[PDB]
Coordinates of C-alpha atoms in Angstrom, one line a residue:
Chain A
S1 CA 111.8 81.8 -101.8
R2 CA 109.8 80.5 -98.9
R3 CA 106.0 80.6 -98.4
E4 CA 105.1 78.1 -95.7
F5 CA 106.1 78.8 -92.1
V6 CA 105.8 76.9 -88.8
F7 CA 106.8 77.8 -85.3
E8 CA 107.1 74.6 -83.2
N9 CA 106.8 74.6 -79.5
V10 CA 106.3 78.3 -78.9
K11 CA 106.4 79.3 -75.2
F12 CA 105.7 82.2 -72.9
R13 CA 108.4 85.0 -73.3
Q14 CA 110.6 83.0 -75.7
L15 CA 111.4 84.6 -79.1
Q16 CA 111.5 82.5 -82.2
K17 CA 113.2 83.7 -85.5
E18 CA 112.2 82.6 -89.0
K19 CA 114.4 84.7 -91.3
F20 CA 114.1 84.5 -95.1
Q21 CA 114.8 86.6 -98.2
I22 CA 112.8 88.4 -101.0
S23 CA 113.5 90.0 -104.4
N24 CA 111.6 91.6 -107.3
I25 CA 103.6 95.2 -96.5
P26 CA 99.9 94.7 -97.2
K27 CA 97.4 93.7 -94.5
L28 CA 94.0 92.1 -94.7
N29 CA 91.2 93.5 -92.6
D30 CA 93.3 94.9 -89.7
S31 CA 90.6 93.1 -87.7
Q32 CA 91.8 89.9 -89.3
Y33 CA 95.3 91.2 -90.1
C34 CA 97.8 89.4 -87.9
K35 CA 98.3 88.3 -84.3
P36 CA 99.7 90.5 -81.5
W37 CA 102.2 87.7 -80.6
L38 CA 103.5 88.1 -84.2
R39 CA 105.0 90.8 -86.3
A40 CA 107.3 91.5 -89.2
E41 CA 110.5 93.5 -89.5
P42 CA 111.3 94.8 -92.0
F43 CA 107.7 94.7 -93.0
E44 CA 108.1 97.1 -96.0
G45 CA 110.7 98.7 -98.2
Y46 CA 111.9 99.7 -101.7
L47 CA 113.4 97.5 -104.3
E48 CA 113.8 97.3 -108.1
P49 CA 116.9 95.2 -109.1
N50 CA 117.9 91.7 -107.9
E51 CA 118.8 92.8 -104.3
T52 CA 117.5 90.4 -101.7
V53 CA 115.4 91.7 -98.8
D54 CA 116.0 89.4 -95.7
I55 CA 112.7 90.0 -94.0
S56 CA 112.5 88.3 -90.6
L57 CA 109.4 86.8 -88.9
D58 CA 109.3 86.7 -85.1
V59 CA 106.8 85.5 -82.5
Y60 CA 106.7 86.5 -78.9
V61 CA 103.9 85.6 -76.4
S62 CA 103.7 88.2 -73.7
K63 CA 101.5 88.7 -70.6
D64 CA 98.7 89.8 -73.0
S65 CA 98.6 86.6 -75.1
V66 CA 99.8 83.9 -72.6
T67 CA 96.4 83.3 -71.0
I68 CA 94.3 83.0 -74.2
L69 CA 96.9 80.6 -75.7
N70 CA 97.2 78.6 -72.5
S71 CA 93.4 77.8 -72.4
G72 CA 93.4 77.3 -76.2
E73 CA 91.0 80.1 -77.3
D74 CA 93.7 81.2 -79.6
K75 CA 96.2 78.9 -81.5
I76 CA 99.5 79.6 -83.2
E77 CA 97.7 80.2 -86.5
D78 CA 97.8 83.5 -88.3
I79 CA 96.9 84.5 -91.8
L80 CA 98.7 87.4 -93.6
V81 CA 98.4 88.8 -97.1
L82 CA 100.4 89.5 -100.3
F83 CA 97.6 84.8 -98.6
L84 CA 100.2 83.6 -96.1
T85 CA 100.3 80.3 -94.2
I86 CA 101.9 79.9 -90.8
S87 CA 101.2 77.6 -87.8
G88 CA 102.8 75.5 -85.1
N89 CA 102.0 74.6 -81.5
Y90 CA 101.8 76.4 -78.2
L91 CA 103.1 74.8 -75.0
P92 CA 100.9 75.9 -72.0
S93 CA 102.5 77.6 -69.0
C94 CA 101.6 77.9 -65.3
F95 CA 102.2 81.7 -65.9
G96 CA 98.8 82.9 -67.1
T97 CA 96.8 80.2 -65.4
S98 CA 94.4 80.8 -62.6
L99 CA 95.4 80.2 -59.0
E100 CA 92.2 78.1 -58.9
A101 CA 93.4 75.7 -61.7
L102 CA 96.9 75.6 -60.3
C103 CA 95.9 74.5 -56.9
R104 CA 94.2 71.4 -58.4
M105 CA 97.3 70.2 -60.3
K106 CA 99.9 68.4 -58.1
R107 CA 102.1 67.9 -61.1
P108 CA 103.8 70.5 -63.4
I109 CA 101.4 71.7 -66.2
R110 CA 103.6 70.0 -68.8
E111 CA 105.1 67.1 -66.9
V112 CA 106.2 64.2 -69.1
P113 CA 103.8 61.2 -68.5
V114 CA 105.3 57.8 -68.0
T115 CA 102.3 56.1 -69.5
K116 CA 104.1 54.3 -72.3
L117 CA 106.4 52.6 -69.8
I118 CA 103.7 51.2 -67.4
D119 CA 103.8 47.4 -67.4
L120 CA 100.1 46.3 -67.2
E121 CA 96.9 45.6 -69.2
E122 CA 93.8 47.6 -68.3
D123 CA 90.5 45.8 -68.1
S124 CA 89.6 44.7 -71.6
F125 CA 86.0 44.0 -70.5
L126 CA 85.8 47.6 -69.4
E127 CA 86.4 48.7 -73.0
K128 CA 83.5 46.5 -74.1
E129 CA 81.6 49.8 -74.5
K130 CA 84.6 52.0 -75.5
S131 CA 84.9 53.5 -78.9
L132 CA 87.3 55.6 -81.1
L133 CA 84.3 57.9 -81.8
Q134 CA 83.3 58.3 -78.2
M135 CA 85.7 60.5 -76.3
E136 CA 91.6 65.6 -54.9
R137 CA 92.1 68.1 -52.0
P138 CA 93.4 71.3 -53.7
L139 CA 96.8 72.6 -52.4
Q140 CA 96.6 75.6 -50.1
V141 CA 98.8 77.5 -52.6
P142 CA 100.1 76.7 -56.1
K143 CA 103.3 74.8 -55.9
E144 CA 104.7 77.2 -58.5
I145 CA 104.3 80.3 -56.3
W146 CA 105.4 78.3 -53.4
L147 CA 108.7 77.3 -55.1
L148 CA 109.4 80.9 -56.0
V149 CA 108.7 82.4 -52.6
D150 CA 110.4 79.7 -50.6
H151 CA 113.4 80.2 -52.7
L152 CA 113.5 83.9 -52.0
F153 CA 113.0 83.1 -48.3
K154 CA 116.0 80.7 -48.3
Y155 CA 118.5 82.7 -50.4
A156 CA 117.5 86.3 -51.0
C157 CA 116.6 88.0 -47.7
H158 CA 120.0 89.7 -47.7
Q159 CA 120.1 90.5 -51.5
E160 CA 121.0 94.1 -52.2
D161 CA 118.5 96.1 -54.2
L162 CA 116.1 93.2 -54.0
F163 CA 112.9 94.1 -56.0
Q164 CA 114.7 97.1 -57.4
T165 CA 117.1 95.3 -59.7
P166 CA 115.7 93.5 -62.8
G167 CA 116.9 89.9 -63.4
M168 CA 118.4 88.4 -66.5
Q169 CA 116.0 87.9 -69.4
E170 CA 117.6 84.6 -70.2
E171 CA 117.3 83.3 -66.6
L172 CA 113.7 84.3 -66.5
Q173 CA 113.0 81.9 -69.4
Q174 CA 114.8 79.1 -67.7
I175 CA 112.8 79.7 -64.5
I176 CA 109.6 79.7 -66.4
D177 CA 110.4 76.4 -68.2
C178 CA 111.6 75.0 -64.9
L179 CA 108.2 75.7 -63.2
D180 CA 106.2 74.4 -66.2
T181 CA 107.9 71.1 -66.3
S182 CA 109.2 70.1 -62.9
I183 CA 109.0 70.7 -59.2
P184 CA 112.7 71.8 -59.0
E185 CA 114.9 71.1 -56.1
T186 CA 116.7 74.4 -56.9
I187 CA 115.2 77.2 -59.0
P188 CA 118.0 78.2 -61.4
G189 CA 119.1 81.9 -61.6
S190 CA 120.0 84.8 -59.4
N191 CA 117.8 86.2 -56.7
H192 CA 117.0 89.1 -58.9
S193 CA 115.8 86.9 -61.7
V194 CA 113.7 84.8 -59.3
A195 CA 112.3 87.9 -57.7
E196 CA 111.2 89.3 -61.1
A197 CA 109.7 86.0 -62.2
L198 CA 107.5 86.2 -59.1
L199 CA 106.3 89.7 -60.2
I200 CA 105.8 88.5 -63.7
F201 CA 103.8 85.6 -62.3
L202 CA 101.5 87.8 -60.2
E203 CA 101.0 90.1 -63.2
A204 CA 100.1 87.4 -65.8
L205 CA 97.4 85.9 -63.5
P206 CA 94.0 85.7 -65.2
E207 CA 92.3 86.7 -61.9
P208 CA 94.4 88.9 -59.5
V209 CA 95.3 87.6 -56.0
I210 CA 92.6 90.0 -54.9
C211 CA 89.5 89.2 -57.0
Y212 CA 88.1 91.9 -59.2
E213 CA 84.7 91.7 -57.5
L214 CA 86.4 92.8 -54.3
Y215 CA 88.7 95.4 -55.8
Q216 CA 86.6 98.5 -54.7
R217 CA 85.8 97.1 -51.3
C218 CA 89.5 97.1 -50.5
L219 CA 90.0 100.7 -51.6
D220 CA 87.0 101.8 -49.5
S221 CA 88.4 100.2 -46.4
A222 CA 92.1 100.9 -47.1
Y223 CA 92.4 103.1 -44.0
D224 CA 90.8 100.6 -41.5
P225 CA 93.3 97.6 -41.2
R226 CA 90.7 95.6 -39.2
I227 CA 88.1 95.9 -42.0
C228 CA 90.8 95.0 -44.6
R229 CA 91.5 91.7 -42.8
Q230 CA 87.8 91.0 -43.1
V231 CA 87.7 91.7 -46.8
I232 CA 90.6 89.3 -47.2
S233 CA 88.6 86.6 -45.4
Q234 CA 85.9 87.1 -48.1
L235 CA 88.3 85.9 -50.8
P236 CA 88.0 82.4 -52.3
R237 CA 90.2 79.8 -50.4
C238 CA 93.4 79.8 -52.5
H239 CA 93.3 83.6 -53.1
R240 CA 93.3 84.3 -49.4
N241 CA 96.1 81.8 -48.7
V242 CA 98.2 83.2 -51.5
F243 CA 97.6 86.7 -50.3
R244 CA 98.5 85.8 -46.6
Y245 CA 101.5 83.9 -47.7
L246 CA 102.8 86.9 -49.7
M247 CA 102.3 89.3 -46.8
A248 CA 104.2 87.0 -44.5
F249 CA 107.1 86.8 -47.0
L250 CA 107.1 90.5 -47.5
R251 CA 107.1 91.2 -43.7
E252 CA 110.0 88.9 -43.3
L253 CA 111.8 90.9 -45.9
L254 CA 111.3 94.1 -43.9
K255 CA 113.2 92.7 -40.9
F256 CA 116.3 93.0 -43.1
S257 CA 115.8 96.3 -44.7
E258 CA 119.3 97.0 -43.5
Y259 CA 120.8 94.5 -45.9
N260 CA 118.3 94.4 -48.8
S261 CA 117.3 98.0 -48.9
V262 CA 113.5 97.2 -49.1
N263 CA 111.1 99.5 -47.3
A264 CA 107.4 99.1 -46.7
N265 CA 106.4 101.9 -49.0
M266 CA 108.5 100.8 -51.9
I267 CA 107.3 97.2 -51.5
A268 CA 103.6 98.0 -51.0
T269 CA 103.7 100.3 -54.0
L270 CA 105.4 97.8 -56.2
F271 CA 103.1 94.8 -55.3
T272 CA 99.7 96.5 -55.0
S273 CA 99.4 97.2 -58.8
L274 CA 100.0 93.4 -59.3
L275 CA 97.8 92.2 -56.5
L276 CA 94.9 94.7 -56.5
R277 CA 93.7 95.5 -60.0
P278 CA 90.5 97.1 -61.3
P279 CA 87.9 95.1 -63.3
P280 CA 89.3 95.8 -66.8
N281 CA 86.0 95.9 -68.6
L282 CA 85.0 99.0 -66.5
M283 CA 87.9 101.0 -68.0
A284 CA 87.8 102.7 -64.6
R285 CA 89.9 105.9 -64.1
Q286 CA 92.8 105.6 -61.7
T287 CA 92.7 108.7 -59.4
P288 CA 95.8 109.6 -57.4
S289 CA 93.9 109.3 -54.1
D290 CA 92.7 105.9 -55.2
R291 CA 96.4 105.0 -55.7
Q292 CA 97.2 106.1 -52.2
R293 CA 94.4 103.9 -50.8
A294 CA 95.6 100.9 -52.9
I295 CA 99.0 101.4 -51.4
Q296 CA 97.7 101.9 -47.8
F297 CA 95.7 98.7 -48.2
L298 CA 99.0 96.7 -48.4
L299 CA 100.9 98.8 -45.8
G300 CA 98.2 97.8 -43.4
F301 CA 99.3 94.2 -43.5
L302 CA 103.0 94.9 -43.7
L303 CA 102.9 96.9 -40.4
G304 CA 99.7 95.7 -38.9
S305 CA 99.0 93.2 -36.1
Chain B
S1 CA 142.8 78.3 -38.3
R2 CA 139.9 75.9 -39.1
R3 CA 139.2 72.5 -37.5
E4 CA 135.5 71.7 -38.2
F5 CA 134.4 70.9 -41.8
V6 CA 131.1 70.1 -43.4
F7 CA 130.2 69.3 -47.0
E8 CA 126.5 69.9 -47.5
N9 CA 124.5 68.3 -50.3
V10 CA 127.3 66.2 -51.8
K11 CA 126.3 64.5 -55.1
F12 CA 127.5 62.0 -57.7
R13 CA 130.4 63.4 -59.8
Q14 CA 130.3 66.9 -58.3
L15 CA 133.5 68.2 -56.7
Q16 CA 133.3 70.3 -53.5
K17 CA 136.2 72.5 -52.3
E18 CA 137.0 73.4 -48.7
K19 CA 140.2 75.4 -48.9
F20 CA 142.0 76.7 -45.7
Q21 CA 145.5 77.6 -44.4
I22 CA 148.1 76.4 -42.0
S23 CA 151.3 77.6 -40.3
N24 CA 153.8 76.5 -37.7
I25 CA 150.2 64.4 -43.3
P26 CA 149.6 61.6 -40.6
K27 CA 147.1 58.8 -41.1
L28 CA 145.3 56.6 -38.6
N29 CA 145.0 52.9 -39.3
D30 CA 145.0 53.1 -43.1
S31 CA 142.1 50.7 -42.6
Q32 CA 140.4 53.6 -40.8
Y33 CA 142.4 56.4 -42.5
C34 CA 140.1 58.4 -44.7
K35 CA 137.4 57.8 -47.4
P36 CA 138.0 57.1 -51.1
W37 CA 135.6 59.9 -52.0
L38 CA 137.9 62.2 -50.0
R39 CA 141.5 63.3 -50.2
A40 CA 143.9 66.1 -49.4
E41 CA 146.2 68.1 -51.6
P42 CA 148.7 69.3 -50.6
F43 CA 148.6 66.7 -47.9
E44 CA 152.2 67.2 -46.7
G45 CA 155.1 69.7 -46.9
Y46 CA 157.9 71.6 -45.3
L47 CA 157.5 74.7 -43.1
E48 CA 159.4 76.6 -40.3
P49 CA 158.6 80.3 -40.4
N50 CA 155.1 82.0 -40.5
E51 CA 154.4 81.0 -44.1
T52 CA 150.8 79.8 -44.5
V53 CA 150.1 76.5 -46.2
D54 CA 146.8 76.7 -48.0
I55 CA 145.9 73.0 -47.9
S56 CA 142.6 72.1 -49.8
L57 CA 140.0 69.5 -48.9
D58 CA 138.1 68.0 -51.7
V59 CA 135.3 65.4 -52.0
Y60 CA 134.3 63.5 -55.1
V61 CA 131.9 60.5 -55.3
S62 CA 132.7 58.4 -58.3
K63 CA 131.2 55.2 -59.7
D64 CA 133.0 53.3 -56.9
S65 CA 131.3 55.2 -54.0
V66 CA 127.9 56.2 -55.5
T67 CA 126.1 53.0 -54.7
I68 CA 127.1 52.5 -51.1
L69 CA 126.2 56.2 -50.4
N70 CA 122.9 55.9 -52.2
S71 CA 121.7 53.1 -50.1
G72 CA 123.2 54.6 -47.0
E73 CA 125.8 52.0 -46.0
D74 CA 128.3 54.8 -46.0
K75 CA 127.7 58.4 -45.0
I76 CA 129.6 61.6 -45.6
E77 CA 131.5 61.1 -42.3
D78 CA 135.3 60.6 -42.2
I79 CA 137.8 60.9 -39.4
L80 CA 141.4 62.0 -40.1
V81 CA 144.4 62.5 -37.8
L82 CA 146.8 65.2 -36.6
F83 CA 141.6 63.9 -34.7
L84 CA 139.7 65.6 -37.5
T85 CA 136.0 66.2 -37.7
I86 CA 134.1 66.4 -41.0
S87 CA 130.5 65.6 -42.1
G88 CA 127.6 66.6 -44.3
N89 CA 124.8 64.9 -46.2
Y90 CA 124.7 62.9 -49.4
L91 CA 121.9 63.3 -51.9
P92 CA 121.0 60.0 -53.6
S93 CA 121.1 59.5 -57.3
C94 CA 119.4 57.2 -59.8
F95 CA 122.9 56.6 -61.1
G96 CA 124.1 53.7 -58.9
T97 CA 120.7 52.4 -58.1
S98 CA 119.4 49.0 -59.3
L99 CA 117.1 48.7 -62.3
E100 CA 114.9 46.8 -60.0
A101 CA 114.4 49.7 -57.6
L102 CA 114.2 52.3 -60.4
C103 CA 111.3 50.5 -62.1
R104 CA 109.3 50.8 -58.9
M105 CA 109.6 54.6 -58.5
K106 CA 107.3 56.6 -60.9
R107 CA 108.9 59.8 -59.5
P108 CA 112.4 61.2 -59.5
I109 CA 114.5 59.7 -56.7
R110 CA 114.7 63.2 -55.1
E111 CA 111.5 64.9 -56.3
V112 CA 110.3 67.6 -54.0
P113 CA 107.2 66.5 -52.2
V114 CA 104.2 68.9 -52.0
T115 CA 103.1 67.6 -48.6
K116 CA 103.3 70.9 -46.7
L117 CA 100.9 72.4 -49.2
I118 CA 98.1 69.8 -49.2
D119 CA 94.9 71.2 -47.7
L120 CA 93.4 68.5 -45.6
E121 CA 93.3 66.8 -42.2
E122 CA 94.1 63.1 -42.0
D123 CA 92.0 60.8 -39.8
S124 CA 92.7 61.8 -36.2
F125 CA 91.1 58.6 -35.0
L126 CA 93.5 56.7 -37.1
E127 CA 96.3 58.2 -35.1
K128 CA 94.6 56.9 -31.9
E129 CA 97.4 54.3 -31.9
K130 CA 100.2 56.3 -33.5
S131 CA 103.3 57.3 -31.5
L132 CA 106.4 59.4 -31.8
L133 CA 108.4 56.3 -30.6
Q134 CA 106.7 53.9 -33.1
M135 CA 107.9 54.4 -36.6
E136 CA 102.1 49.4 -58.1
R137 CA 102.9 47.9 -61.5
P138 CA 106.6 48.4 -62.1
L139 CA 107.6 50.3 -65.2
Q140 CA 108.9 48.2 -68.1
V141 CA 112.1 50.2 -68.0
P142 CA 113.4 52.9 -65.7
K143 CA 112.2 56.3 -66.8
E144 CA 115.8 57.6 -66.4
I145 CA 117.2 55.2 -69.0
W146 CA 114.2 55.8 -71.1
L147 CA 114.6 59.6 -71.0
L148 CA 118.3 59.2 -72.1
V149 CA 117.7 56.8 -74.9
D150 CA 114.6 58.4 -76.3
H151 CA 116.6 61.7 -76.4
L152 CA 119.4 60.1 -78.4
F153 CA 116.7 58.6 -80.7
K154 CA 115.1 62.0 -81.4
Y155 CA 118.2 64.2 -81.7
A156 CA 121.4 62.2 -82.2
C157 CA 121.1 59.5 -84.9
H158 CA 123.1 61.8 -87.2
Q159 CA 125.6 63.0 -84.7
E160 CA 129.2 62.7 -85.9
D161 CA 131.6 60.6 -83.9
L162 CA 128.6 59.6 -81.7
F163 CA 129.9 57.3 -78.9
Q164 CA 133.5 58.2 -79.9
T165 CA 133.5 61.8 -78.6
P166 CA 133.4 62.5 -74.8
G167 CA 130.8 65.0 -73.6
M168 CA 131.3 68.1 -71.4
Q169 CA 132.0 67.2 -67.8
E170 CA 129.8 70.2 -66.8
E171 CA 126.9 69.0 -68.9
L172 CA 127.1 65.5 -67.4
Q173 CA 126.5 66.9 -64.0
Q174 CA 123.5 68.9 -65.2
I175 CA 122.1 65.8 -66.9
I176 CA 122.6 63.8 -63.7
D177 CA 120.9 66.4 -61.5
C178 CA 118.2 66.6 -64.1
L179 CA 117.3 62.9 -64.0
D180 CA 117.5 62.8 -60.2
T181 CA 115.0 65.6 -59.6
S182 CA 112.7 65.7 -62.6
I183 CA 111.2 63.9 -65.6
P184 CA 112.6 66.5 -68.0
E185 CA 110.8 67.6 -71.1
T186 CA 114.2 68.2 -72.6
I187 CA 117.5 66.7 -71.3
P188 CA 120.0 69.6 -71.3
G189 CA 123.4 69.2 -73.1
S190 CA 124.8 68.1 -76.4
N191 CA 124.3 64.6 -77.9
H192 CA 127.8 63.7 -76.9
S193 CA 127.1 64.6 -73.2
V194 CA 123.9 62.7 -73.3
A195 CA 125.5 59.7 -74.9
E196 CA 128.2 59.6 -72.3
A197 CA 125.8 59.9 -69.4
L198 CA 124.1 56.8 -70.7
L199 CA 127.4 54.9 -70.6
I200 CA 128.1 56.3 -67.1
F201 CA 124.6 55.1 -66.1
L202 CA 125.1 51.6 -67.4
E203 CA 128.5 51.4 -65.7
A204 CA 127.4 52.6 -62.3
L205 CA 124.6 50.1 -62.1
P206 CA 124.8 47.9 -58.9
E207 CA 123.8 44.8 -61.0
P208 CA 124.7 44.8 -64.8
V209 CA 121.9 44.8 -67.4
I210 CA 123.0 41.1 -67.8
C211 CA 123.0 39.7 -64.3
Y212 CA 126.2 38.3 -62.9
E213 CA 124.6 34.9 -62.4
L214 CA 124.1 34.7 -66.2
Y215 CA 127.5 36.2 -67.2
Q216 CA 129.2 32.9 -68.1
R217 CA 126.2 31.4 -69.8
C218 CA 126.3 34.3 -72.3
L219 CA 130.0 33.7 -73.0
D220 CA 129.5 30.0 -73.6
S221 CA 126.7 30.6 -76.1
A222 CA 128.1 33.7 -77.7
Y223 CA 128.4 32.0 -81.1
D224 CA 124.9 30.7 -81.2
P225 CA 122.6 33.7 -81.6
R226 CA 119.5 31.5 -81.0
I227 CA 120.7 30.3 -77.7
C228 CA 121.7 33.9 -76.8
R229 CA 118.1 35.0 -77.2
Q230 CA 117.1 32.3 -74.8
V231 CA 119.6 33.3 -72.2
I232 CA 118.2 36.8 -72.4
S233 CA 114.7 35.5 -71.8
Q234 CA 116.1 34.1 -68.5
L235 CA 116.8 37.5 -67.2
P236 CA 114.5 39.1 -64.6
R237 CA 111.7 41.2 -66.2
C238 CA 113.2 44.7 -66.2
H239 CA 116.7 43.5 -67.1
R240 CA 115.4 41.8 -70.2
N241 CA 113.4 44.9 -71.2
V242 CA 116.3 47.2 -70.7
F243 CA 118.5 44.9 -72.7
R244 CA 116.1 44.6 -75.6
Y245 CA 115.4 48.3 -75.6
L246 CA 119.2 49.1 -75.9
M247 CA 119.7 46.6 -78.7
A248 CA 116.8 48.2 -80.6
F249 CA 118.3 51.6 -80.1
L250 CA 121.8 50.5 -81.2
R251 CA 120.4 48.8 -84.3
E252 CA 118.6 52.0 -85.2
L253 CA 122.0 53.7 -84.9
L254 CA 123.6 51.3 -87.4
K255 CA 121.1 52.3 -90.1
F256 CA 122.9 55.7 -90.1
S257 CA 126.5 54.6 -89.9
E258 CA 127.0 56.9 -92.9
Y259 CA 126.2 60.0 -90.8
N260 CA 127.3 59.0 -87.3
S261 CA 130.3 56.8 -88.1
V262 CA 129.2 54.0 -85.7
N263 CA 129.8 50.5 -86.7
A264 CA 128.6 47.2 -85.1
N265 CA 132.1 46.2 -83.9
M266 CA 132.9 49.5 -82.3
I267 CA 129.4 49.7 -80.6
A268 CA 129.4 46.1 -79.5
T269 CA 132.9 46.4 -78.1
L270 CA 132.1 49.6 -76.2
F271 CA 128.8 48.4 -74.7
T272 CA 129.6 44.8 -73.8
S273 CA 132.0 45.7 -71.0
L274 CA 129.2 47.9 -69.5
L275 CA 126.4 45.4 -70.0
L276 CA 128.1 42.0 -69.6
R277 CA 130.4 42.0 -66.6
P278 CA 132.0 39.1 -64.5
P279 CA 131.0 38.5 -60.8
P280 CA 133.6 40.8 -59.1
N281 CA 134.0 38.5 -56.1
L282 CA 135.4 35.8 -58.3
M283 CA 138.3 38.0 -59.4
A284 CA 138.0 36.1 -62.7
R285 CA 140.8 36.4 -65.4
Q286 CA 139.7 38.1 -68.6
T287 CA 141.2 36.0 -71.5
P288 CA 141.4 37.6 -75.0
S289 CA 139.2 34.8 -76.4
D290 CA 136.6 35.5 -73.6
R291 CA 136.7 39.1 -74.8
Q292 CA 135.9 38.1 -78.3
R293 CA 132.9 36.0 -77.1
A294 CA 131.7 38.9 -75.0
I295 CA 131.8 41.1 -78.1
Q296 CA 130.2 38.4 -80.4
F297 CA 127.4 38.0 -77.8
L298 CA 126.3 41.6 -78.6
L299 CA 127.0 41.5 -82.3
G300 CA 124.5 38.6 -82.5
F301 CA 121.7 41.0 -81.6
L302 CA 122.9 43.9 -83.6
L303 CA 122.9 41.9 -86.8
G304 CA 120.6 39.0 -85.9
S305 CA 117.0 38.4 -86.8

């Protein structure tokens, strides 16, 4: 019935349907089969008469595909077999972009340019060498994380089960689209949704707040809060600012454990796996005592000096 | 029970409640009574026992108050009598701001500044004379009108009863807040809501697309489409561009009368009272033949050369 398929404007954590029917499962080299951000269901069955099999095609970019697609490495182009043709375009997101790159962009990653409205004429003598064949101070912290944290500061310090309750999937999308296209005056959604988007953000980061190269150093000094401060100072500029900003926010949260039910241990446990992660290419084993050190490393700042 | 009242962050076409009770109507000089963007209901009644009268206080800035508040002339400060104290703050809107001022602002009128994130130190020797006691090319068209019109171009040319059906009051608010704080990638709401916000925008303008000083000239030449083009050329830069842009959009709409049900006469009648208005201080009479000329003036461009 249908053969050609295109998914226009695909975005992080947004599902797109492309239902269709069949009437009367293969996979090419599973190395060239399909794409992780794409799958079929039902992708196989039994038929013999005229009965129509309404097989659906869905795409969903998760934390595992967001960063390759952002950069461009991968594109919304996948080839199946039965050959199948499908394409579209992927809209970049601040989620899955380095803190480094984000601190250099004062505007949303997808802000609409007003270029076609500007009333002027660039130097024509400057284009005397142009051709159709010939193609500053970084922010202390990404505005995106700032918008999320400042919001929680202002409206969620007294939120019950804060960082224990999962937000609304639908509000998470809004929040994401919001940060990708504007510097909102008010982040939409409930405190739970905003709190989760922050975790999702820290998790999708290409390079953790605490750089991989410093991962082990932190573990080794986890019990000496003074040495931990020093390791932090070793981090690149924006990583250290983002780290310090988060600890300040989390400490502020503790002052209201009475109302929000957050305790140092819970918080430190929750955030450490997002902030302090092992170099993935070393497929390093995660010992239970290494887990305690990773937790202690954060507790040091949440109760330190 | 309550005496002090404050309405924080009041905005164009957004109602704010401030309910309270009483138990056991006056007005100061009605010249100093209350403010049009404020009223009471119930504002009078009968009582003698302990019964509590839950009188509500509401504020609503409409097309008549938006522009004075934007500029600042008026502030959310009104004094009642029984003396009553109430205040707050008003957030400016692009709705009710001149086309002149809007073409000079490349950013939303209320975009969140990222100043407190910037990582740098301004010249301290430049502040060697500073003191706590001592305080470029305009766009061809306001981005706000551009965002509204381009949206209708892209998604509403085939909308049924377009410009005949009123949008959702709740979506109109969103759209307004959207344009005031961001350069949206996608205006929220249905085509009917977007179409109405455009009318609301043209109506709240401080100075009509066609300047008051040229109002009569247009009427006088309404039957000579060639002279009408010339009068348009007389308009200040941005007013002529906005006018031409609108006519192009409306003509495009006519090419699909079949689908959207819009006809030149309906359109021209609807838009002329928004685009071509009489200098209000002349309390000029609106004769039925002057109404036909005002309509003809627009028809000339919708069917002209």
